[PDB]
Design an enzyme around this catalytic site. Sequence first.
Site, PDB file in Angstrom:
ATOM      1  N   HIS A   1      95.950   5.801  30.302  1.00  0.00           N
ATOM      2  CA  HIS A   1      97.269   6.401  29.986  1.00  0.00           C
ATOM      3  C   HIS A   1      98.355   5.336  29.907  1.00  0.00           C
ATOM      4  O   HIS A   1      99.337   5.412  30.652  1.00  0.00           O
ATOM      5  CB  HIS A   1      97.578   7.485  30.980  1.00  0.00           C
ATOM      6  CG  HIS A   1      96.780   8.710  30.739  1.00  0.00           C
ATOM      7  ND1 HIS A   1      95.721   9.051  31.537  1.00  0.00           N
ATOM      8  CD2 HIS A   1      96.914   9.687  29.820  1.00  0.00           C
ATOM      9  CE1 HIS A   1      95.225  10.201  31.118  1.00  0.00           C
ATOM     10  NE2 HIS A   1      95.947  10.613  30.067  1.00  0.00           N
TER      11      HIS A   1
ATOM     12  N   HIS B   1      97.345   3.641  24.389  1.00  0.00           N
ATOM     13  CA  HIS B   1      97.140   5.098  24.188  1.00  0.00           C
ATOM     14  C   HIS B   1      98.325   5.662  23.395  1.00  0.00           C
ATOM     15  O   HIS B   1      98.093   6.355  22.383  1.00  0.00           O
ATOM     16  CB  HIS B   1      96.895   5.805  25.525  1.00  0.00           C
ATOM     17  CG  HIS B   1      96.909   7.291  25.413  1.00  0.00           C
ATOM     18  ND1 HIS B   1      95.930   7.986  24.775  1.00  0.00           N
ATOM     19  CD2 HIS B   1      97.790   8.212  25.846  1.00  0.00           C
ATOM     20  CE1 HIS B   1      96.190   9.277  24.829  1.00  0.00           C
ATOM     21  NE2 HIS B   1      97.332   9.439  25.460  1.00  0.00           N
TER      22      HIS B   1
ATOM     23  N   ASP C   1     103.329  10.069  26.987  1.00  0.00           N
ATOM     24  CA  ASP C   1     102.736   9.781  28.332  1.00  0.00           C
ATOM     25  C   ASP C   1     103.593   8.756  29.108  1.00  0.00           C
ATOM     26  O   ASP C   1     103.064   8.103  30.024  1.00  0.00           O
ATOM     27  CB  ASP C   1     101.283   9.323  28.211  1.00  0.00           C
ATOM     28  CG  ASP C   1     100.234  10.423  28.223  1.00  0.00           C
ATOM     29  OD1 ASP C   1     100.465  11.483  28.831  1.00  0.00           O
ATOM     30  OD2 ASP C   1      99.159  10.190  27.636  1.00  0.00           O
TER      31      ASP C   1
ATOM     32  N   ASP D   1      96.276  13.518  20.674  1.00  0.00           N
ATOM     33  CA  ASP D   1      96.166  13.085  22.083  1.00  0.00           C
ATOM     34  C   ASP D   1      94.705  12.866  22.412  1.00  0.00           C
ATOM     35  O   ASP D   1      94.415  11.962  23.208  1.00  0.00           O
ATOM     36  CB  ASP D   1      96.782  14.097  23.031  1.00  0.00           C
ATOM     37  CG  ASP D   1      96.985  13.540  24.423  1.00  0.00           C
ATOM     38  OD1 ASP D   1      97.183  12.311  24.561  1.00  0.00           O
ATOM     39  OD2 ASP D   1      96.919  14.337  25.357  1.00  0.00           O
TER      40      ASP D   1
ATOM     41  N   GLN E   1      80.542  15.097  28.961  1.00  0.00           N
ATOM     42  CA  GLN E   1      81.057  14.818  27.596  1.00  0.00           C
ATOM     43  C   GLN E   1      80.631  15.942  26.649  1.00  0.00           C
ATOM     44  O   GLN E   1      81.492  16.340  25.844  1.00  0.00           O
ATOM     45  CB  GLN E   1      80.626  13.437  27.099  1.00  0.00           C
ATOM     46  CG  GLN E   1      81.333  12.300  27.828  1.00  0.00           C
ATOM     47  CD  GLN E   1      82.832  12.423  27.705  1.00  0.00           C
ATOM     48  OE1 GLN E   1      83.384  12.306  26.624  1.00  0.00           O
ATOM     49  NE2 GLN E   1      83.499  12.693  28.820  1.00  0.00           N
TER      50      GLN E   1
HETATM   51  C1  LIG Z   1      89.761  17.773  29.525  1.00  0.00           C
HETATM   52  N1  LIG Z   1      89.283  17.378  30.860  1.00  0.00           N
HETATM   53  C2  LIG Z   1      90.448  17.185  31.740  1.00  0.00           C
HETATM   54  C3  LIG Z   1      88.262  18.332  31.386  1.00  0.00           C
HETATM   55  C4  LIG Z   1      86.939  18.277  30.559  1.00  0.00           C
HETATM   56  N2  LIG Z   1      85.991  17.164  30.877  1.00  0.00           N
HETATM   57  N3  LIG Z   1      84.876  17.301  31.705  1.00  0.00           N
HETATM   58  C5  LIG Z   1      84.342  16.126  31.922  1.00  0.00           C
HETATM   59  C6  LIG Z   1      83.189  15.923  32.828  1.00  0.00           C
HETATM   60  C7  LIG Z   1      82.743  17.014  33.586  1.00  0.00           C
HETATM   61  C8  LIG Z   1      81.713  16.785  34.493  1.00  0.00           C
HETATM   62  C9  LIG Z   1      81.177  15.486  34.642  1.00  0.00           C
HETATM   63  C10 LIG Z   1      81.704  14.449  33.884  1.00  0.00           C
HETATM   64  N4  LIG Z   1      82.682  14.709  33.016  1.00  0.00           N
HETATM   65  C11 LIG Z   1      85.139  15.139  31.288  1.00  0.00           C
HETATM   66  C12 LIG Z   1      86.116  15.802  30.597  1.00  0.00           C
HETATM   67  N5  LIG Z   1      87.162  15.202  29.856  1.00  0.00           N
HETATM   68  C13 LIG Z   1      87.170  14.029  29.197  1.00  0.00           C
HETATM   69  O1  LIG Z   1      86.153  13.387  29.075  1.00  0.00           O
HETATM   70  C14 LIG Z   1      88.446  13.618  28.547  1.00  0.00           C
HETATM   71  N6  LIG Z   1      89.591  14.232  28.911  1.00  0.00           N
HETATM   72  C15 LIG Z   1      90.779  13.946  28.380  1.00  0.00           C
HETATM   73  C16 LIG Z   1      92.029  14.697  28.818  1.00  0.00           C
HETATM   74  C17 LIG Z   1      93.358  13.935  29.005  1.00  0.00           C
HETATM   75  C18 LIG Z   1      92.604  14.475  30.223  1.00  0.00           C
HETATM   76  C19 LIG Z   1      90.862  12.967  27.394  1.00  0.00           C
HETATM   77  C20 LIG Z   1      89.697  12.311  26.964  1.00  0.00           C
HETATM   78  C21 LIG Z   1      88.471  12.609  27.556  1.00  0.00           C
HETATM   79  N7  LIG Z   1      87.299  11.957  27.182  1.00  0.00           N
HETATM   80  C22 LIG Z   1      87.238  10.858  26.306  1.00  0.00           C
HETATM   81  C23 LIG Z   1      86.019  10.481  25.689  1.00  0.00           C
HETATM   82  N8  LIG Z   1      86.004   9.423  24.878  1.00  0.00           N
HETATM   83  C24 LIG Z   1      87.130   8.756  24.638  1.00  0.00           C
HETATM   84  N9  LIG Z   1      88.294   9.090  25.187  1.00  0.00           N
HETATM   85  C25 LIG Z   1      88.389  10.112  26.021  1.00  0.00           C
HETATM   86 MG   LIG Z   2      99.574  13.286  28.950  1.00  0.00          MG
HETATM   87 ZN   LIG Z   3      98.097  11.301  26.219  1.00  0.00          ZN
END
Ligand SMILES: CN(C)CCn1nc(-c2ccccn2)cc1NC(=O)c1nc(C2CC2)ccc1Nc1cncnc1
Ligand SMILES: [Mg+2]
Ligand SMILES: [Zn+2]
Length: 313
Positions: free
Chosen positions: A68, A72, A107, A217, A269
């Site tokens: 962040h 970004h 952010d 985002d 993922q």
């Molecule tokens: C949206 N989440 C807050 C809840 C869902 N969730 N559950 C798991 C998870 C659940 C269980 C085990 C491991 N992981 C991981 C996620 N989220 C992300 O991966 C993620 N989130 C965000 C949002 C700003 C926060 C941004 C990017 C993300 N990925 C990413 C991948 N490649 C490049 N850039 C970014």
């Molecule tokens: Mg934010």
């Molecule tokens: Zn952001």
Amino acid sequence: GLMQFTLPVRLCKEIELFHFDIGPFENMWPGIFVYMVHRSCGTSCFELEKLCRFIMSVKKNYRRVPYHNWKHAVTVAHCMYAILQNNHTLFTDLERKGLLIACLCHDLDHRGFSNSYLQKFDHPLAALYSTSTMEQHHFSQTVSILQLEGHNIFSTLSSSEYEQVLEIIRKAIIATDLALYFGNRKQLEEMYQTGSLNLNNQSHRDRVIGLMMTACDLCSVTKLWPVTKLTANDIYAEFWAEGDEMKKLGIQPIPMMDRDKKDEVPQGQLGFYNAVAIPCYTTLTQILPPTEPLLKACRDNLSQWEKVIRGEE
Ligand SMILES: CN(C)CCn1nc(-c2ccccn2)cc1NC(=O)c1nc(C2CC2)ccc1Nc1cncnc1
Ligand SMILES: [Mg+2]
Ligand SMILES: [Zn+2]
């Protein structure tokens, strides 16, 4: 006025594409942003002296956190640039002005912790802003920087144009609160399907602009696999630090934030692309057909995570 920003040929071409990575040279990111403002908005939209001074204050007020961070901010602004450039006539003069700045500022002063950790830590920001804690803070920081002497890039706008653009930016930044995305996309889904979607309805544009903000985002999932894979490490570096801090408060963190559960990341993922990213870019493509490349890239990366699970990488 007659001063253009130009990029090297490879950037000049690649910056127009959704999957463009802004590169590892920090000192080129400001010029990349100005280049994008000049092509997206005009050489005239902002006094360059004022824009440059705003850009460097915004930079100063991003922290040295793994995800962040300033890179970004510019990444998310570039994705908005691509959406705007592929949807020329759909967006007003003010919206192109407001949205690139909203993306750069969305952010500001992020600490690398979720709204949930602020709430459980009992951070002073959680008492000031009960919901969308960090996002209300990021808008608050945007207004403070605009009010620094010599920083008001919007000075040449009428009083009413000024109130409209700050309103566009406020709604835009609040919408980056992923907790508001689920309901926003579902409402846009029904509207598109039942045929009631109407871009002349301001409450409707607001929703569409909010989905664009979620799409920009989350745009690290729409890059080439190597960019997406290496950005995944940065997001998990924050998530794990946040999990560490939850353990310090005596709270077992969710698996996403538990560095003792790295094994569950590929599956996490999958959940994330299926539950969040794929629906976001699907609904966005339905509303804004030219943004299809984001959905295609997001799908390519879902397929890459499936291959990681299957053992092929
Ligand atoms: C949206 N989440 C807050 C809840 C869902 N969730 N559950 C798991 C998870 C659940 C269980 C085990 C491991 N992981 C991981 C996620 N989220 C992300 O991966 C993620 N989130 C965000 C949002 C700003 C926060 C941004 C990017 C993300 N990925 C990413 C991948 N490649 C490049 N850039 C970014
Ligand atoms: Mg934010
Ligand atoms: Zn952001």
